Amino acid sequence: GHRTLASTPALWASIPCPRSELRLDLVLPSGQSFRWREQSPAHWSGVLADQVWTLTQTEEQLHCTVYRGDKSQASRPTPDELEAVRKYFQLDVTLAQLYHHWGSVDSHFQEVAQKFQGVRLLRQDPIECLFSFICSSNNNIARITGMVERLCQAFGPRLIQLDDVTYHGFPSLQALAGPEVEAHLRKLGLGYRARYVSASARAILEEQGGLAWLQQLRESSYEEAHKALCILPGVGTKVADCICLMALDKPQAVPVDVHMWHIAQRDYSWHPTTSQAKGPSPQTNKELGNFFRSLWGPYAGWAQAVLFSADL
């Protein structure tokens, strides 16, 4: 079944990484990616780039193992595979300097940072991110996590089965654009958003050129990327911001919803000023987003991530 470092050490490869730079337990289930579960104490297993991985860490090292199936000899991750993991967690970025900066302009963040170290922003795949946040609202992590799993088990390739868990890759655009998708997804419990999955897949696979379109937004400006995504069915300002931040390399993006409003009110006593509205709205939400961006800087999105992990 699921591997453990202690049970099959010869099948694990390590990546130099202090616990001060990463805390799997605070990142994997914090609402960025919904593809990871701690199937075993301190061991997180999930799907990363069409491959099942299990990850665990020691004080100074992030241990990794990948499952290859019956077509290939079981062996430790190769240098390139490990590099894929490093990019996923964006380890090239020194968290220390970010935490230092955020704390220097925000006493509240400084106090929260003390108990919540190693919170970083994952670099997810565009398609996986886009459709995960479109298939369901995000009011509850447990909820969207179940919906994403149903989405993958319904149109995602079967990768492998460990113990009583069948892992599936993320559905391809062609699979989501296929007929009867909405109907089947609804039968699964998805809801009306099952329509956006199908519609968006078809909109991209066709009217947008296809996969290349998303990969392009990664290089486009945050302003272009966000505006481009909003044309897709089910993609609003908030969802577009998540994708920009989590998958299109736009760290300054700050997804604003009722959750962030609570944080702003509870921890910053923030109040709208540029808008007459006192509660959430297209105008006040943008002002709120700009408030944190101007406060925290170009990586405002990562700072938000730290507060979210702390609030779980």
UniProtKB/Swiss-Prot annotation:
Effect recorded for G1E: Found in a kidney cancer sample; no effect on activity; abolishes mitochondrial localization
Keywords: DNA damage, DNA repair, Glycosidase, Hydrolase, Lyase, Mitochondrion, Multifunctional enzyme, Nucleus
GO terms for MF: 8-oxo-7,8-dihydroguanine DNA N-glycosylase activity; class I DNA-(apurinic or apyrimidinic site) endonuclease activity; damaged DNA binding; DNA binding; endonuclease activity; enzyme binding; microtubule binding; oxidized purine DNA binding
Signal peptide: none
Keyword Nucleus: yes
Enzyme Commission no: 3.2.2.-, 4.2.99.18
Residues given in the record as DNA binding sites: N138, R143, R193, H259, Q276
Residues annotated as catalytic: K238
Gene3D superfamilies: 3.30.310.40, Helix-hairpin-Helix base-excision DNA repair enzymes (C-terminal), Hypothetical protein, domain 2
Record-linked Pfam families: HhH-GPD, OGG_N
Domain of life: Eukaryota
Localization per Swiss-Prot or TrEMBL: Nucleus, Nucleoplasm; Nucleus speckle; Nucleus matrix
Binding site for 8-oxoguanine: P255, D257, Q304, F308
GO biological process: base-excision repair; base-excision repair, AP site formation; cellular response to reactive oxygen species; depurination; depyrimidination; DNA damage response; negative regulation of double-strand break repair via single-strand annealing; nucleotide-excision repair
Tissue: Ubiquitous.
Catalytic activity: 2'-deoxyribonucleotide-(2'-deoxyribose 5'-phosphate)-2'-deoxyribonucleotide-DNA = a 3'-end 2'-deoxyribonucleotide-(2,3-dehydro-2,3-deoxyribose 5'-phosphate)-DNA + a 5'-end 5'-phospho-2'-deoxyribonucleoside-DNA + H(+)
Annotated family: Belongs to the type-1 OGG1 family.
Disease connection: Renal cell carcinoma: Renal cell carcinoma is a heterogeneous group of sporadic or hereditary carcinoma derived from cells of the proximal renal tubular epithelium. It is subclassified into clear cell renal carcinoma (non-papillary carcinoma), papillary renal cell carcinoma, chromophobe renal cell carcinoma, collecting duct carcinoma with medullary carcinoma of the kidney, and unclassified renal cell carcinoma. Clear cell renal cell carcinoma is the most common subtype.
Record's function text: DNA repair enzyme that incises DNA at 8-oxoG residues. Excises 7,8-dihydro-8-oxoguanine and 2,6-diamino-4-hydroxy-5-N-methylformamidopyrimidine (FAPY) from damaged DNA. Has a beta-lyase activity that nicks DNA 3' to the lesion.
The name this protein goes by in its record: N-glycosylase/DNA lyase
Source organism per UniProt: Homo sapiens
